[PDB]
Amino acid sequence: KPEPTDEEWELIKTVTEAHVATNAQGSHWKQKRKFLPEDIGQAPIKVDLEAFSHFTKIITPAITRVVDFAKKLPMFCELPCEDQIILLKGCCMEIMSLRAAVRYDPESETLTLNGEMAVTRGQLKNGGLGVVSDAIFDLGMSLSSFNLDDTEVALLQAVLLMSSDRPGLACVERIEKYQDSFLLAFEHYINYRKHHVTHFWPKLLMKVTDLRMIGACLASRFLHMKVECPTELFPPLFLEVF
Amino acid sequence: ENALLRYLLDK
Ligand SMILES: Cc1nc(C(=O)NCC(=O)O)c(O)c2ccc(Oc3ccccc3)cc12
């Protein structure tokens, strides 16, 4: 099967370095991690607002890491400022969810947010995510046997970031051109890696769909989070990506 | 709108 060209290797290196340099705690994350205690994030009587507070505090640096990842990609910097904002609003939650999902620990059954906070399925559920919490944990469980490396995670992030179907974009064709560069490099790098999983590329393309769904559902659930909570309670950067 | 995100993109 075809493997990366020299231009594709260059591209591989760029996004991998962008990902590694924006990924919280990087190599240290499993040592710097503290478990959110069980008494926070239990099921009420709606939202457990003490758990909500802990996630409310860490969402801003999570978004910001994503902004810093996109800025390290020369193709993203080519785009007009308006398309950049559109692309960031659309892929932020998709990329954060992915970054949490690859940090699943089956021994504890936790995801690690922000490189620091390990939370359980029930805590992330009751802290405001609802059924989207089950979707992220299921994604993380099925990603163990895929054994993704930093390059593969980096390229998934790129594929999500260069989504030309976001509403309001002007460089629809330009952005889709970029996405096909990542996808072909990604396929060729996957051909070169020889995973012991059958139909790996098809199965990976299905996980991209999974993340797009999580993304679209977080946006749904945040409007249904303006019920018990007033907008003041959400940090400003979070509101910007409705 | 998007003043915060926009300043993070310009920084
Ligand atoms: C989906 C994801 N991820 C991360 C994250 O930092 N981890 C991934 C990473 O290493 O970057 C978060 O910190 C999140 C925080 C809140 C959140 O929703 C909520 C927002 C407000 C209230 C409750 C949940 C989703 C997150």
Numbering used by the authors:
A (entry chain A): 211 to 255, 263 to 459
B (entry chain C): 741 to 751
Wording from the paper:
The thyroid hormone receptors (THRs) are nuclear hormone receptors regulated by endogenous thyroid hormones, including the inactive prohormone thyroxine (T4) and the bioactive hormone 3,3′,5-triiodothyronine (T3), which are critical for development regulation and metabolic homeostasis. As ligand-regulated nuclear receptors, THRs have a structurally conserved LBD that allows the binding of distinct ligands (Burris et al., 2013). Following the ligand binding, the function of THRs is mediated through the selective recruitment or release of specific coregulators, like the family of steroid receptor coactivators (SRCs) (Li et al., 2003, Jin and Li, 2010, Savkur and Burris, 2004), as a heterodimeric complex with retinoid X receptor (RXR) (Putcha et al., 2012, Kojetin et al., 2015, Mangelsdorf and Evans, 1995). Although the defects in any of the processes in thyroid hormone transport and synthesis can all contribute to RTH, in most cases the disorder involves defective thyroid hormone receptors, resulting in reduced T3 binding and disruptive thyroid hormone signaling.
As expected, the native ligand T3 abolished or substantially diminished the transcriptional activity of four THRβ mutants associated with thyroid hormone resistance, V264D, H435L, R438H, and R438W, respectively (Wakasaki et al., 2016, Nomura et al., 1996, Sabet and Pallotta, 2011, Narumi et al., 2010). Surprisingly, the treatment of roxadustat either enhanced or retained the transcriptional activity of these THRβ mutants, all leading to higher induced transcriptional activity than those of T3. In contrast, the binding of roxadustat resulted in higher Tm values for four TRβ mutants than that of T3. Although all four mutant residues are located in the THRβ LBD, H435 is the only one that directly contacts ligands T3 or roxadustat, whereas the rest of the mutant residues are located outside the ligand-binding pocket, not in the range to form intimate contacts with the ligands, which makes us wonder how these mutants influence the ligand binding. To unravel the molecular basis for the RTH of the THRβ mutants and further their beneficial susceptibility to roxadustat, we performed structural studies on the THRβ mutants complexed with roxadustat. The structural analysis further revealed an apparent conformational change of residue H435 on helix 10 of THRβ for all four mutants, resulting in the loss of a critical hydrogen bond between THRβ and a critical hydroxy group of T3, which is also conserved for the other THR ligands identified so far, explaining the severely reduced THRβ activity by T3. Specifically, in addition to the direct mutation of H435 to the hydrophobic leucine of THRβ H435L, the allosteric conformational changes of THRβ H435 were coupled with several intermediate structural changes, predominantly in helix 10, which were initiated by mutants R438H, R438W, or V264D, consequently leading to impaired T3 binding.
